[PDB]
Amino acid sequence: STGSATTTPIDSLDDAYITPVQIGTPAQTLNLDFDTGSSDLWVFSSETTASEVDGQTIYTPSKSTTAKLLSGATWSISYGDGSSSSGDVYTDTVSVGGLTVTGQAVESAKKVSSSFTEDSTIDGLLGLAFSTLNTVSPTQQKTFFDNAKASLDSPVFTADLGYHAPGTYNFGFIDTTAYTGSITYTAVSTKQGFWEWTSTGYAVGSGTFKSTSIDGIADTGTTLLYLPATVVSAYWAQVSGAKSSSSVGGYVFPCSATLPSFTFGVGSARIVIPGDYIDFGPISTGSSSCFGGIQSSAGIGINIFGDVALKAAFVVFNGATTPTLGFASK
Numbered sequence: 001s002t003g004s005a006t007t008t009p010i011d012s013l014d015d016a017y018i019t020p021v022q023i024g025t026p027a028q029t030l031n032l033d034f035d036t037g038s039s040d041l042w043v044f045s046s047e048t049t050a051s052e053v054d055g056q057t058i059y060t061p062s063k064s065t066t067a068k069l070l071s072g073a074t075w076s077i078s079y080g081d082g083s084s085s086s087g088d089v090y091t092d093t094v095s096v097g098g099l100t101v102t103g104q105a106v107e108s109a110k111k112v113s114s115s116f117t118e119d120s121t122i123d124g125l126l127g128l129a130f131s132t133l134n135t136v137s138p139t140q141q142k143t144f145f146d147n148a149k150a151s152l153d154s155p156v157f158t159a160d161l162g163y164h165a166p167g168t169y170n171f172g173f174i175d176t177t178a179y180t181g182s183i184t185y186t187a188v189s190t191k192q193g194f195w196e197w198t199s200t201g202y203a204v205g206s207g208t209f210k211s212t213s214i215d216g217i218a219d220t221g222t223t224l225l226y227l228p229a230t231v232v233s234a235y236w237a238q239v240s241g242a243k244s245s246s247s248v249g250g251y252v253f254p255c256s257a258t259l260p261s262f263t264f265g266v267g268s269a270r271i272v273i274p275g276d277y278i279d280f281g282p283i284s285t286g287s288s289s290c291f292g293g294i295q296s297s298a299g300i301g302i303n304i305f306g307d308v309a310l311k312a313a314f315v316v317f318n319g320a321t322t323p324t325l326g327f328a329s330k
């Protein structure tokens with residue numbers, strides 16, 4: 001089997017991407033944030049505290065003839081932005097782009113943090129990291145990908161995120177028309193539950209490539225590119241007037257600037273992030289100070305190849321017995 005679904009930016013800055021997902025019978029379609037940095041499929045629901053729901057579409061398990069309460073199971077998760085959610089668990093039929101899994105754990109939110117409430121466009125998350133990170137207790141549950149894997153034509157999914165435009169998540173096949181040149185594959189460590197890999201280095205604009213190992217995670221659920229302070233300083237030094245602002249919480253730059261590109265290494269290959277992918281716009285409405293898309297990972301404890309990096313590539317998440325990651329230009 002295979003599946004293919006379009007993923008759409010939630011706003012004009014590509015802050016996140018939503019993909020429609022069919023849950024239950026008859027189908028209830030919710031727009032989920034596909035997140036390769038976590039492993040829980042959770043949704044706004046009829047059980048979510050009413051004051052914490054503000055425009056989201058909810059899953060109502062009582063209206064699904066295939067929903068079954070997973071007795072005794074609860075979940076609770078936090079993310080790198082300090083947001084969180086928790087609740088109980090159903091199993092139900094879940095389809096993505098024509099690919100169907102029966103008995104998928106659908107984690108129903110009883111509580112969500114303010115950032116989720118305040119974002120009307122995201123109805124929940126669909127985790128695509130390794131199932132070892134799944135938070136369901138006392139019986140850990142499998143991701144949608146993990147459940148589907150054995151049925152897929154090939155045990156892979158691909159992320160093809162757009163810049164200010166829709167893109168595609170495919171399951172079970174590699175669309176050879178969706179990228180240019182070749183896909184370069186690179187080793188993955190699953191030891192922390194993430195799609196963790198090592199970039200071979202970077203360049204800033206037309207500058208020389210610096211060969212240096214940068215361990216990080218391929219994370220579709222994180223907006224920005226978070227890299228070591230040395231790398232980030234080298235990037236922003238090429239932008240006149242850019243500075244790190246403790247009050248704003250990162251590098252900002254004059255909105256009048258033309259940003260240089262940023263290249264990262266994948267083996268001997270190179271992925272180029274155009275400068276305008278790194279512009280996240282005014283820090284507040286009407287400001288001439290703009291927020292940068294490359295930020296320091298110091299304090300996070302891990303480097304994160306988030307959407308800013310991933311949307312410059314066609315990315316293969318290879319879930320073979322020994323997982324690997326593939327990157328191609330597009």
Ligand SMILES: O=C(Cc1cn2ccccc2n1)Nc1ccccc1
Pocket residue numbers: 033035037038078079080081083125219221222300302304
């Ligand atoms: O937390 C994540 C993945 C992530 C962040 N998110 C924020 C909002 C919505 C979804 C979502 N997913 N990645 C991460 C961050 C820090 C350290 C390790 C992984």
